[PDB]
């Protein structure tokens, strides 16, 4: 339990989105057995999308559903030996990230064709400058998986919280998730305001809160697997604390960050005057605050407590 002073929201079209969530990944070759389908439904991935994107319905919401489907199918391809070899991790991430640049060869693994279909749908109808900034966010995410594989290979665990966050902030995938809230909402935050120091601090709070929530929710699955790059394990190594002290420390950190997040929300009216936002930009920035940044913070908190997540080698083979 944590202090998330934000209203819980869920798309009114969530029942349909959960009922139809399997048709897209099955048609892409991402779910190939019936047991794989049930394993997927147990993740609650359409549920998570409907809470990340409460403002989306219909096809817009289905794009968010497919993003969560692909994202967790993708992340599963690295829990095994591939996530241990940075050469093989890079080999796969480069075939996925290639879709950001052009058409994939038909020999690409299905996980890459899945990403290509999502990225094609994310960009259509957005400004080219928005597509380029989002493609950069994806490349940061893929490169982060190669850094995590480098840490496991050379058996160099993250010795500090600082060194962990510099790596986990990219692999958590929050920024590509927030980017899709703009696409699913059919709006764009003023690009000069996205780059502002105030917005970056708010975005960084949303990332930190998410990875802290995830490191606590999946501590058992990572303790039973000897993983050393988890915030509760790193705090015990960095500060010599117990498990009960590090966990309560992480509650205080998500506590302090969400109060600082409120402080920054109150600065946005002044931030808009600084960048001379017209009324339309003022509204798009308001939508970004409530339908993209707030939703990625609150939506993750509700879903980490309800997700069942707390044989796929075919998807990464040419």
Ligand X SMILES: C/C(=C\CC/C(C)=C/COP(=O)(O)OP(=O)(O)O)CCC=C(CF)CF
- Is 21 or 307 the residue whose CB approaches Mg ion more closely? 307
- Is 192 or 221 the residue whose CB approaches ligand X more closely? 221
Chain residues 238-297 in contact with Mg ion, contact rule CB under 5 A:
none
- Is 73 or 131 the residue whose CB approaches Mg ion more closely? 73
Binding segment for Mg ion among 110-118, 122-130, 176-184, 216-224 (CB under 5 A)? 216-224
61 binds, options ligand X, Mg ion, none, Cβ within 5 to 8 A by partner type: none
Binding segment for Mg ion among 72-80, 149-157, 158-166, 309-317 (CB under 5 A)? 72-80
210 binds, options Mg ion, ligand X, none, Cβ within 5 to 8 A by partner type: ligand X
SS (H, E, C) 10-68: CCCCHHHHHHCCCHHHHHCCCCCCHHHHHHHHCCCHHHHHHHHCCCCCHHHHHHHHHHH
Binding segment for Mg ion among 94-102, 211-219, 244-252, 281-289 (CB under 5 A)? 211-219
Task: Kindly list the distances between the CA atom of residue 31 and the CA atoms of 62, 89, 220, 290, in Å, as whole numbers in the listed order.
Answer: 17, 21, 26, 34
Sign for the CA dihedral angle at 242, 243, 248, 253 comes to positive
> Is 79 annotated as a binding-site member?
yes
> Is 229 annotated as a binding-site member?
no
Q: Give me the residue whose beta carbon is nearest to Mg ion.
A: 218
- Is 200 or 269 the residue whose CB approaches ligand X more closely? 200
- Is 221 or 305 the residue whose CB approaches ligand X more closely? 221
Is 214 a binding residue for Mg ion by CB under 5 A? The answer is yes
List residues near ligand X by CB under 6 A.
Answer: 71-72, 75, 171-174, 176-177, 210-211, 214, 218, 221, 300, 309
Distance from chain centroid for Cα 169: 10
- Is 219 or 268 the residue whose CB approaches ligand X more closely? 219
Sign for the CA dihedral angle at 244, 246, 247, 251 comes to positive
CA–CA gap between residue 36 and residue 315 (Å, rounded): 12
Contact with Mg ion (CB under 5 A): which of 218, 228, 251, 290?
218
- Is 176 or 185 the residue whose CB approaches ligand X more closely? 176
Q: Is 4 left (phi over 0), alpha (psi -120 to 50) or beta?
A: beta
42 binds, options ligand X, Mg ion, none, Cβ within 5 to 8 A by partner type: none
Contact 285, 189 (CB under 8 A): yes
Is 75 a binding residue for Mg ion by CB under 5 A? The answer is yes
What is the CB neighbour count within 10 angstroms for residue 102? 8
CA–CA gap between residue 71 and residue 236 (Å, rounded): 30
- Say which residues have a Cβ less than 8 Å from residue 233's Cβ, sequence separation at least 6: 222, 227
Q: Give me the residue whose beta carbon is nearest to ligand X.
A: 173
Contact 96, 173 (CB under 8 A): no
71 binds, options ligand X, Mg ion, none, Cβ within 5 to 8 A by partner type: ligand X
- Owner of token pair 């993740």: 43
CB of 184 to Mg ion, least distance (A): 24
- Say which residues have a Cβ less than 8 Å from residue 215's Cβ, sequence separation at least 6: 230, 231, 232, 250
Is 151 a binding residue for Mg ion by CB under 5 A? The answer is no
| Residues placed in the known binding site for Mg(2+) | 75, 79, 214, 218, 222
| Residues placed in the known binding site | 75, 79, 214, 218, 222
Q: Residue numbers of the site for Mg ion (CB under 5 A)?
A: 75, 214, 218
């Amino acid at each position: 339990d944590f202090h998330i002073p934000l209203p819980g929201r869920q798309s009114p079209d969530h029942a349909r989105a959960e009922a139809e969530q399997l048709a897209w990944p099955r048609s892409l070759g991402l779910i190939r057995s019936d047991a794989a389908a049930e394993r997927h439904l147990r993740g609650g991935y359409a549920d998570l999308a409907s809470r990340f994107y409460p403002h989306a319905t219909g096809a817009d919401l289905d794009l968010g559903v497919d993003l969560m489907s692909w994202a967790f199918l993708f992340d599963d391809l690295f829990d095994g030996p591939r996530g241990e070899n940075p050469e093989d991790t890079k080999q796969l991430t480069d075939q996925v990230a290639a879709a950001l640049d052009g058409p994939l060869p038909d020999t690409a693994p299905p996980i890459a064709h899945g990403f290509a279909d999502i990225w094609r749908r994310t960009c259509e109808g957005m400004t080219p400058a928005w597509c380029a900034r989002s493609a950069r966010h994806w490349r940061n995410y893929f490169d982060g998986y190669v850094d995590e594989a480098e840490s496991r290979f050379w058996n160099a665990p993250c010795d500090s919280a600082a060194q962990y966050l510099a790596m986990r902030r990219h692999t958590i995938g929050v920024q590509p998730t927030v980017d899709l809230a703009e696409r699913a909402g059919r709006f764009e935050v003023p690009h000069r305001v996205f780059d502002s120091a105030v917005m970056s601090a708010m975005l960084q709070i949303a990332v930190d809160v998410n990875l802290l929530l995830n490191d606590i929710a999946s501590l058992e699955k990572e303790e039973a697997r000897g993983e050393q790059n988890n915030m509760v394990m790193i705090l015990r190594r960095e500060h010599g604390w117990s498990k009960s002290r590090s966990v309560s420390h992480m509650q205080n950190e998500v506590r302090a960050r969400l109060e600082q997040y409120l402080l920054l929300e109150s600065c946005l009216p002044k931030v808009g005057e600084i960048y001379q936002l017209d009324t339309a930009e003022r509204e798009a920035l308001e939508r970004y605050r409530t339908d993209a940044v707030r939703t990625v913070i609150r939506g993750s908190y509700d879903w980490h407590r309800s997700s069942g997540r707390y044989y796929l080698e075919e998807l990464g083979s040419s």
